[PDB]
């Protein structure tokens with residue numbers, strides 16, 4: 001109750017850290033792949049298209065990398081054990097991209113970077 | 119330029135395995151040279167990708183609900199590049215467990231932190247990958263003798279927890295090696311020492327046991343076979359190459375649906391051994407996979 005009320009806006013803190021000129025989290029594991037994949041955001045195997053890089057999920061998850069509890073139900077990670085596709089233009093900061101962007105529940109593409117359900 | 123440059127790496131030729139060399143100091147012409155990797159790709163992602171590309175050419179058993187354990191999976195970066203490559207390579211749904219002396223975050227289904235000697239399991243495994251390396255190996259003060267440490271655990275883990283038909287890939291170097299491990303290679307249908315092309319400038323190799331038979335097929339003297347390995351490396355320079363990393367179209371391990379059966383030690387006849395030797399049979403029960411990490415209780 002009081003422990004939950006205090007907790008720690010880690011997603012908000014990372015955006016402020018970058019705004020202050022902080023160097024983005026490194027050592028995100030980039031995978032070798034064909035780059036002829038579906039282009040969906042989070043997949044069981046690398047699915048990067050010609051405009052994306054595929055990375056090991058756990059290495060791009062702020063919560064996994066910082067050893068802090070996950071917000072998702074019962075601390076369930078959505079990247080661990082999977083592969084996340086990141087636009088080549090934003091591959092310099094995969095942790096920042098996954099936090100600031102959200103996946104479309106219909107086509108499985110990143111909203112604003114592949115989803116065209118409109 | 120060399121033909122082997124388009125391969126993921128180079129395996130120890132059979133004639134070098136049949137020699138009786140004395141151990142010599144390893145002296146590589148290109149020692150330490152770094153490979154030219156694709157932009158932003160880590161050395162360990164490239165290395166495991168080439169190991170997996172080579173494993174795709176062997177008769178590996180690939181059963182439904184395959185079980186794979188990866189020792190020495192943590193890096194000084196706090197992540198598991200090799201585990202990410204194994205999970206990309208293995209069929210979806212493959213149970214993948216990894217472990218390391220040091221904490222790290224992984225894509226594996228379960229991760230155990232601590233010395234590999236603290237890892238227990240009643241379950242048998244289909245594939246064992248080890249990248250363990252003792253940093254103290256760099257302190258070459260004495261003669262290059264067989265090393266114990268995690269190697270005694272790996273040998274016992276193979277003899278007790280590897281399913282018949284299963285395979286292993288255990289990392290060795292000039293000084294990080296074990297005679298009993300080489301002797302165990304004679305308990306597989308086939309074996310080799312495989313050198314990744316991205317690490318051609320290192321004495322590193324993966325000792326690969328293909329299709330475990332649970333009995334000696336050939337007698338191997340470990341002290342002689344490691345001397346043979348160093349002689350091969352000292353007389354066969356390998357050109358650094360990352361060419362195989364650019365073609366990932368056939369990368370995923372082919373799902374073979376390999377039969378899984380339970381058999382007493384008296385049911386292992388020549389006909390069963392023949393199926394094990396072709397990657398068409400795995401012998402173990404299909405019970406729940408349970409692992410544990412021994413915790414030492416102190417004040």
Ligand SMILES: C[n+]1cn([C@@H]2O[C@H](COP(=O)(O)OP(=O)(O)OP(=O)(O)OC[C@H]3O[C@@H](n4cnc5c(N)ncnc54)[C@H](O)[C@@H]3O)[C@@H](O)[C@H]2O)c2nc(N)[nH]c(=O)c21
Pocket residue numbers: 144145146147149251253255256258291292293294317319320321322
């Ligand atoms: C083969 N070799 C060994 N040495 C000497 O003997 C020592 C021990 O030799 P080694 O058994 O460590 O073998 P090698 O040097 O080939 O290993 P390398 O450093 O390439 O490491 C291979 C792999 O081991 C792992 N590894 C190495 N060091 C570490 C570490 N500190 N932490 C974690 N993993 C490590 C990595 O996965 C790495 O890719 C070397 O540190 C060096 O002084 C050589 N010297 C010359 N001049 N020419 C050689 O050809 C040569």
Ligand SMILES: C[n+]1cn([C@@H]2O[C@H](COP(=O)(O)OP(=O)(O)OP(=O)(O)O)[C@@H](O)[C@H]2O)c2nc(N)[nH]c(=O)c21
Pocket residue numbers: 175176177178307308328329395396
């Ligand atoms: C790669 N491999 C080699 N052998 C044995 O070795 C024989 C051929 O050995 P080889 O495969 O090394 O020679 P090849 O000329 O086929 O090609 P190379 O690999 O480029 O040199 C096989 O018929 C088997 O007896 C193997 N035996 C088993 N069971 N499994 C393997 O994966 C395997």
Ligand SMILES: Nc1ncnc2c1ncn2[C@@H]1O[C@H](CSCC[C@H](N)C(=O)O)[C@@H](O)[C@H]1O
Pocket residue numbers: 162189190191192193194198199200201217218219220232233234235249250251252253267268
């Ligand atoms: N006795 C032991 N038990 C467990 N891990 C051990 C060990 N001796 C060495 N190691 C581990 O062996 C590893 C060698 S480096 C491993 C690199 C890793 N495979 C990657 O994908 O990048 C180190 O992380 C070290 O902690």
Ligand SMILES: [Cl-]
Pocket residue numbers: 068069070074075076
């Ligand atoms: Cl959590």
Ligand SMILES: [Cl-]
Pocket residue numbers: 264265266267
């Ligand atoms: Cl020792």
Ligand SMILES: [Cl-]
Pocket residue numbers: 266267270
């Ligand atoms: Cl010991």
Ligand SMILES: [Cl-]
Pocket residue numbers: 332333334
């Ligand atoms: Cl035996």
Ligand SMILES: [Zn+2]
Pocket residue numbers: 058061062063064065070077078079080
């Ligand atoms: Zn996470």
Ligand SMILES: [Zn+2]
Pocket residue numbers: 104105106107108109115116117
């Ligand atoms: Zn959509």
